[PDB]
Every structure is written in C-alpha cells, then in structure tokens.
C-alpha cells in the first residue's frame, strides 16, 4: 500500500522467427503466475529450447537472456499439434520459475532464476528508451516474421495438399505450383517482405485448382 514489488520489464520466451513472446507484462505486481500453450515449429520435432527473455524489444536478440533449457521426449507429430504449456511463476521472494510441460507425455523441465538476475536499474531505464526509440523498426521486424510465417504455412500446407492430391492435380497445375513453391521457399531464405508476398501472390494464382481438390476431400 506504500510499495509494490512489480516487474519493471516484460518476461517471456523466444518463439519461431526470433520473436520475444511476453508471458508476464511489464509493471505486473508479484506474486503472479501466467501460462500459455505453444507447439513445434518443425514436423517430427523431438524437443523445444525454452529461451527466457527480459525486456520490451520485439526481436529476441535485443532482449536480456535470463537462461535457456530444453524439454526432450516430444513424440513424433506434425508441427503445430503438440501442446507445450509454458508457465512463468514469480513468488513473494521475487524468484521466477519457468516450467515447460508436454501435455501428451506428462514430461516437464524447469529453470529457476534468482530475484537478482536480469537488468539493473540503469539498464531497465535504458532498455525502455530503446523500446520507445525503435517502436517503428521493431514493428517492421514483427511484420516480416508474420509474413515469413504466413509464407512458410502456405509453403508447407501446399506440399501436403499436392501429396494428398496425387493424380487428381493436372500435371500442368503441378509444374506451375512446384516452380512457385521453389521460388517461395527461396524468398523465405531472405529479408525482403515484398518479395515473399509476391511469391505468395504467385502461389495463390496457380493453385486455384489445387485448392478445389483439397476442399473436396
């Protein structure tokens, strides 16, 4: 009532494309416990790296690393299907417990992070200034990650549907789609959003037949 223990900065993890995803917001009062279910980036992915982050930048690398740990033992599955529940729990003593749990296998790994870890009083004020200073740039980085992840979904989903479609797809549509996927995959290697979007545009324009078959099944 005259003081609050608060988090001066956001806490969370690295997600696909090197984004800091927040679990406990800035200026949250302790104690607190937030959880969020995530999944695998890759088919038949057997493990996840939980990279614990402090700060307000959208790029994971522009934030303070509080440590990392692995959860192993993820049974073969398509990407996006496993349920990995991540829990950030800060107690009365100011200690952060991060758990990751495979909701299928029951398996769990934690890291514990001293109240004293992370950025000191300067570096916080500094970190805040950079967040406000780089709101534009961080926003542009977010949009390229989102675009990359939309491009890769279109990529990976179109390949599946081609395999699922076999002889249904007129060879002439296959040729055009295969060339667009090769070109989209190439563009996703790069940093030019416009070009990713252009290969996505091209894929949609040659796939209209593939999409009918897929819907039908």
């Amino acid at each position: 009532v005259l003081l609050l223990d608060v988090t001066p900065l956001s806490l969370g993890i690295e997600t696909m494309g090197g984004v800091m995803t927040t679990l406990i917001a800035k200026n949250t009062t302790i104690p607190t416990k937030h959880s969020q279910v995530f999944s695998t980036a890759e088919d038949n992915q057997s493990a996840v790296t939980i990279h614990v982050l402090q700060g307000e930048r959208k790029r994971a690398a522009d934030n303070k690393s509080l440590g990392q740990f692995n959860l192993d033992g993820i049974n073969p599955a398509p990407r996006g299907m496993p349920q990995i529940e991540v829990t950030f729990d800060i107690d009365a003593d100011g200690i952060l417990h991060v758990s990751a749990k495979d909701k299928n296998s029951g398996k769990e790994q934690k890291i514990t992070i001293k109240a004293s870890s992370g950025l000191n009083e300067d570096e916080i004020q500094k970190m805040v200034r950079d967040a406000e200073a780089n709101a534009e740039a961080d926003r542009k980085f977010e949009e390229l990650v989102q675009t990359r992840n939309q491009g890769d979904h279109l990529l990976h989903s179109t390949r599946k549907q081609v395999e699922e479609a076999g002889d249904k797809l007129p060879a002439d549509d296959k040729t055009a789609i295969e060339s667009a996927l090769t070109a989209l995959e190439t563009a996703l290697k790069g940093e030019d959003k416009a070009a990713i979007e252009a290969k996505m545009q091209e894929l949609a324009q040659v796939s209209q037949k593939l999409m009918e078959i897929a819907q039908q099944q």
Binding site: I13, M16, T21, A41, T49, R79
Partner: peptide
C-alpha cells in the same frame, strides 16, 4: 505459436 529446437 511455435518454438524451435
């Protein structure tokens, strides 16, 4: 949302 290895 997805995590890499």
């Amino acid at each position: 949302l997805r995590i890499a290895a």
